[PDB]
C-alpha cells in the first residue's frame, strides 16, 4: 500500500510515459 | 450488457 | 468521461469497480488506496432519494480492468467487501457534503503490473499541488455524453476512458452554481474562454482523480468524482470530494479498522 504507492509498474518504473502525461506536469 | 463471472465469486 | 481517450494499459493501476452482483451492472469507480482499502465516493452506497443502501453483501469490487464489459480472466481480481465505512456527516439531503465512503476487503489483493495503489496528499503535496490551472487526471467507465437530448448512439465506452481536467479558482466554482459549495469540495474544467471540452459524467462516481507530483515522480488522490449539473455543458464544472481535508477522517477509521 503506502511507502511503495504512486508508481505504476508498466511506467514509472520503467521509466516510461503514458501519452498524456506531460500535458500535466507542464500545467505545473 | 456485462460478461458473467465464475460462480464462486 | 466526456471527451477523453481511452486508457492505456496499466495507466491506472488504482482505479477499481464497484460491480453489483443482482442485476450485474458497474455501480460507481473506486481506487485501490492499500491492499485491504478502497476509497469511493459516498453516493455510490447511500442515496435515499433513488432508494439507495447497499450492503457489505450487496456487491463486488473488480480490480485490474481494462475493458468495461468483458471479464478479463487472469488479469483482473474480484474481491468481497468485509466492512463499509461511509462518512458520519455525509449530506445526501442537500449539497453532497462529504461525500466520501471507504471499503475494507475481506482479503487483501495481490498486486500485480495492472493492480497497485494510489497514493493519499498531504499537508505539503496539497499545498503545492491543488492549485487553480493545474491539471489533474479522471478515469472512469461511465457515460460518454451527457444522458439526454437526441443522442442518437452508443454512449458507453468498451474500454477505460481518461481526461486530464485543469483545477479552477473557488470564486468561479461557487459562481457556476445556485448549489451550496463547501471546502470538502472543489471543481474542475475548462472556463468558458478556453473553448475547449472534457469532463466526467453520470457512471464515473467515486473514481480517482489524480495529480502527478514533480517532487517525487507519485501519483497523489487529490479528488473523488462527487456531482454535477449535466455533463461537458457550458460555464459548469465538476465537483469532485476534496480528499486532504477529509484525510483526518481517513486515518481514524483505517488504524481503527485494520
Ligand atoms: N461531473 C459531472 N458533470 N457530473 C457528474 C455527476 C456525478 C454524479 O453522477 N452525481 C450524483 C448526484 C446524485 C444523483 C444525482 N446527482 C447529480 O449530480 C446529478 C447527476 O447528474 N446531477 S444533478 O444536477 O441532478 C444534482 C443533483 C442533485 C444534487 C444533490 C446534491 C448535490 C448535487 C446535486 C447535483
Given at each position: ?10 511506467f ?17 | ?9 | ?27 460507481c ?5 492499500s491492499?485491504?482499502?478502497?476509497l ?5 452506497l447511500?442515496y ?6 447497499f ?27 468485509e ?8 449530506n ?36 503545492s ?37 485543469p483545477?479552477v ?11 451550496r ?12 474562454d478556453?473553448?475547449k471540452?472534457?469532463?466526467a ?17 507519485r ?33 481514524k ?6
Amino acid at each position: 500500500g503506502e511507502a511503495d504507492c504512486g508508481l505504476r509498474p508498466l511506467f514509472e518504473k520503467k521509466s516510461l510515459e503514458d501519452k498524456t502525461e506531460r500535458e500535466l506536469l507542464e500545467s505545473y | 450488457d456485462f460478461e458473467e463471472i465464475p460462480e464462486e465469486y | 468521461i466526456v471527451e477523453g481517450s481511452d486508457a492505456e494499459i496499466g495507466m491506472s493501476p488504482w482505479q477499481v469497480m464497484l460491480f453489483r452482483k443482482s442485476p450485474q451492472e458497474l455501480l460507481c469507480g473506486a481506487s485501490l488506496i492499500s491492499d485491504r482499502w478502497v476509497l469511493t465516493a459516498a453516493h455510490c452506497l447511500l442515496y435515499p432519494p433513488w432508494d439507495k443502501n447497499f450492503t457489505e453483501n450487496d456487491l463486488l469490487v473488480r480490480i485490474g480492468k481494462h475493458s468495461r464489459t468483458r471479464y478479463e480472466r487472469n488479469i483482473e481480481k474480484i474481491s468481497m467487501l468485509e466492512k463499509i465505512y461511509i462518512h458520519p456527516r455525509y449530506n445526501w439531503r442537500e449539497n453532497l457534503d462529504r461525500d466520501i465512503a471507504l471499503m475494507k476487503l475481506k482479503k487483501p489483493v495481490a498486486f500485480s503490473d495492472y493492480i497497485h495503489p494510489v497514493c493519499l496528499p498531504d499537508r505539503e503535496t496539497a499545498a503545492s499541488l491543488l492549485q487553480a490551472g493545474y491539471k489533474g487526471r479522471v478515469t472512469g467507465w461511465g457515460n460518454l455524453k451527457e444522458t439526454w437530448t437526441a443522442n442518437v448512439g452508443k454512449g458507453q465506452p468498451s474500454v477505460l476512458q481518461v481526461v486530464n481536467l485543469p483545477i479552477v479558482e473557488r470564486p468561479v466554482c461557487k459562481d457556476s452554481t445556485r448549489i451550496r459549495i463547501t471546502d470538502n469540495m472543489f471543481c474542475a474544467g475548462y472556463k468558458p474562454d478556453e473553448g475547449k471540452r472534457g469532463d466526467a459524467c453520470e457512471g464515473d462516481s467515486g473514481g480517482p482523480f489524480v495529480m502527478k507530483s514533480p517532487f517525487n515522480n507519485r501519483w497523489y488522490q487529490m479528488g473523488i468524482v462527487s456531482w454535477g449539473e449535466g455533463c461537458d455543458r457550458d460555464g459548469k464544472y465538476g465537483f469532485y470530494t476534496h480528499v486532504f481535508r477529509l484525510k483526518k477522517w481517513i486515518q481514524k477509521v483505517i488504524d481503527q479498522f485494520g
